[PDB]
Structures are given as C-alpha cells and as structure tokens.
Design a protein around this ligand. Structure first.
Ligand SMILES: Cc1ccc(O)c(C)c1-c1cc(-c2ccnc(N3CCOCC3)c2)cc(C(N)=O)c1N
Length: 280
C-alpha cells in the first residue's frame, strides 16, 4: 500500500483537494492535474505544463526523478520548498502555489511562466537592447526583494530567469538560495560565479555580480568562460571588448558597476534600481 500525499511546507497535513479522492489508486498529481506538455527534464526531475482540476488555471509542476534514498536526501530536497516559501509573493519571482510529497517523490507547483532567458536567446542574432533593459530591471527587483529578506541566490543565470507577460522577467529555482547559518547548498555555474565565492565568501553582492554576467551573456550572445584566463579577465573590473560589440555605452556602464570584483565596491540592487536609466 502507499501512504497518502502529504503537503510540504515549513510554515505551520494530508493533501485534500476538490477532485482528489484518496480511495482511488492514482496519485494526487495524476488525479488533480491535466498534463499538457513537458517543459524540461534532467537529473533534477521533470517539469510539466498542467491545468489544475481544482481551479481550471494553468501551472507548472516540477517532480523529482527518483524516490528519496534516506532521511537526509529527503530533507535536502524538501529544503527547496522552505527556501521558496521565504521568497513568497513578488511580481519578479516565480510564485510557489503548493508542494507535496507522494511515493517518495517531491512535487512543486508554481505559476506557469514562459521560456527561460536561455531559451529565449537561443531561439531569437542579438536581443534588442530595450528587451535586455527590461530583463535587467525585473531581475534587479527580484534581487532587491531577496536581499530585503536576507536571502542570496547563488545561481543567477539565464536558465533560471523566466519570461512573463509584456517583456517581464521572473527569477526562479530557489534550491540554491542561502539565508544570511548558510544551510546546505550545491555548486553554482562557474561561468557566472562572483570571484569572492572562490574563498567561500558570499553576500547580497554575489547575486548582483552573477546577474551582471547573466545580462552580459544574453546581450552579447557569446558563451562565457568556465575557467582559465578568460574567467579571470571578466573579474578584473573592466569589460573585455570581446563581449561588448554592439552593447550601448549606457548598458556597458551599468554592467561594469555590477561586475566590480570587490564586493564592497560593487553596486547594490537598490542603488542600480535608483539610476535614472533604470527608472520605471
Ligand atoms: C516548476 C518549477 C518549480 C520551482 C521553480 O523554482 C521553478 C522555476 C519551476 C519552473 C521550472 C521550469 C523549467 C523548465 C525547463 N528547465 C528548467 N531547468 C531548471 C534549472 O536548470 C535548467 C533547467 C526549469 C519552467 C517553469 C515555467 N515555465 O513555468 C517553472 N515554473
């Protein structure tokens, strides 16, 4: 026999939902959602576009790949939900609707978003810069929100930022969020990593640096180095001309503020948002 689905939350039960019958053998996920498409799959699991039977609206649902192997494995996976709950509701962050576990599998149901910035770039040669400014501003708003909550995203990158309506950006994938102890956290993508993280040092500034390289990459449509001399030369306090062909003086000026190697000299999200060029 199989235990009933249980809600996963770190705030304050078995899952009951209109349309869900525990008497029937299919999973909560099978009974309570219509699977429309698969949006992604990897070792992290699978992500589906679904329609909810409870309210008729569209959502995304992520489910892990294999059953929990032991109590610590379970605890580490469930921690994503606690982190996401700390982020809560914000128009530039992917909103978690509910999470549950059934059959040793973890499900996160969120609002449905569009393609990642990685995907949008790939299927776009370069993005119009007005689009890029929108993505920069919206993800800065997300970072100001995270920092307001004493949170740092240690894996800001094009794959973790999702398009929304009319040019809007939402930051997601909060499994590598840390609170300002740190908690367990996995290896972020070296391409976008702030230099201080090599010495294990982190803070609000690290995700500003990663957003800087994220936006640089999408604006120039060139792969950033994962190590070696080219990695070092993006972390010196200048923009290598290799990456700035086409980029306006205005965008360059803001990126260099974000890419300052000394996290004490690096701009904050709120200071960037207060720049005339990022108004509204
Ligand atoms: C379901 C969910 C739960 C928590 C969460 O934080 C998020 C973002 C999502 C969520 C994830 C994805 C998605 C699609 C394909 N690949 C990835 N990847 C992950 C990072 O590595 C690359 C591959 C992610 C798409 C959407 C969507 N469009 O609505 C979505 N909401």
């Amino acid at each position: 026999h199989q235990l009933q689905p249980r809600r996963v939350s770190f705030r304050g039960e078995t899952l009951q939902s209109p349309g869900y019958d525990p008497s029937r053998p299919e999973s909560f996920f099978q009974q309570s959602f219509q699977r429309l498409s698969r949006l992604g799959h990897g070792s992290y699991g699978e992500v589906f576009k679904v329609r909810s039977k409870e309210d008729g609206r569209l959502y995304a649902v992520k489910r892990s790949m294999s059953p929990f192997r032991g109590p610590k494995d379970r605890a580490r996976k469930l921690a994503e939900v606690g982190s996401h709950e700390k982020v809560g509701q914000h128009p530039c962050c992917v909103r978690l609707e509910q999470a549950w576990e059934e059959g040793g599998i973890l499900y996160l149901q969120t609002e449905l978003c569009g393609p990642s910035l990685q995907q949008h770039c790939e299927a776009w040669a370069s993005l119009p810069e007005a689009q890029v400014w929108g993505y920069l501003r919206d993800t800065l708003l997300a970072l100001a929100h995270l920092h307001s909550q004493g949170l740092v995203h240690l894996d800001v990158k094009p794959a973790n930022i999702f398009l929304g309506p009319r040019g809007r950006c939402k930051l997601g994938d909060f499994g590598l969020l840390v609170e300002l102890g740190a908690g367990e956290v996995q290896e972020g993508d070296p391409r976008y990593m702030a230099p201080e993280l090599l010495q294990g040092s982190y803070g609000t500034a690290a995700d500003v640096f990663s957003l800087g390289l994220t936006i640089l990459e999408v604006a120039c449509n060139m792969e950033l180095p994962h190590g070696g001399e080219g990695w070092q030369q993006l972390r010196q306090g200048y923009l290598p001309p290799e990456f700035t062909a086409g980029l306006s003086s205005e965008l360059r000026s803001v990126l260099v503020m974000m890419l300052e190697p000394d996290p004490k000299l690096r701009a904050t999200a709120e200071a960037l948002l207060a720049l005339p060029v990022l108004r509204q």
